[PDB]
Amino acid sequence: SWCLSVHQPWASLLVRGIKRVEGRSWYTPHRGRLWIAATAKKPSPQEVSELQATYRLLRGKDVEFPNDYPSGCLLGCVDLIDCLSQKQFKEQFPDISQESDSPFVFICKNPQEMVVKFPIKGNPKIWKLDSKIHQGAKKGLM
């Protein structure tokens, strides 16, 4: 039921598995499924192209990006398997530690992207999905 709001284009990159961690200033004890919602902040087309070029160099020239980075909607989910300090992050993930310098680094696995994305209004930190949205989101994962 719990959800995290993330700015595009990073939000869709997370549920695609292209972005593997998300950094925040705060720790969460939450583990397991964490839904990912895009915030309402629309990224400029310049931001999107520049971030895609960067991720092409980190992951490979043939990485398959989403066609669109919709804002203000529920995108999918990840498994939040750990929430590491920056010191722990460098120790455990040397190969990607450069990908977040935040005080706490959310380590994400098993991303799933919803085929039908639903409009939603987010909140700070981890918040709970409304039950109707949650129900439809689970169906749309099949």
Add this chain to the structure above:
Amino acid sequence: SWCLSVHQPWASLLVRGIKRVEGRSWYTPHRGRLWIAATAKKPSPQEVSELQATYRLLRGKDVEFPNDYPSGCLLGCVDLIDCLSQKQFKEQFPDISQESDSPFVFICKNPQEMVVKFPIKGNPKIWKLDSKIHQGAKKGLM
């Protein structure tokens, strides 16, 4: 007929004779009567009080300020008796040269303040009053 738009509170200080020069980046050959309009930009109350305190120290503790600094209206007129370079301004007006560091300094005399101020839309540089406004403004000078 010619008019200059000036930000408040400087605009009303000009037609009161409290402010004696107005600086601009450009020269004008205009001499004689120059109407003064306030721009549409409303000054914060903090700006007004700070500028009044400064002019109190330059002119005297008992200087009589206007009760209000209305925006977007025709305030009065001055006689533009010269348009001096900054070098000329320092040479001719040593006692007030510190009051403008602009490339050109408009030297104003014989300020008159209209008792009824009329709403107006300004333009850059020196512009011409509409004839109906001009007619009423001259009457209101009596």
Add this chain to the structure above:
DNA sequence: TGAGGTACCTCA
């Protein structure tokens, strides 16, 4: 967060 008030920027 998302929303909106506002200061800043630009103007065939």
Add this chain to the structure above:
DNA sequence: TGAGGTACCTCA
């Protein structure tokens, strides 16, 4: 100029 589009800031 004055007007408005927009980025920035703040939020009992």
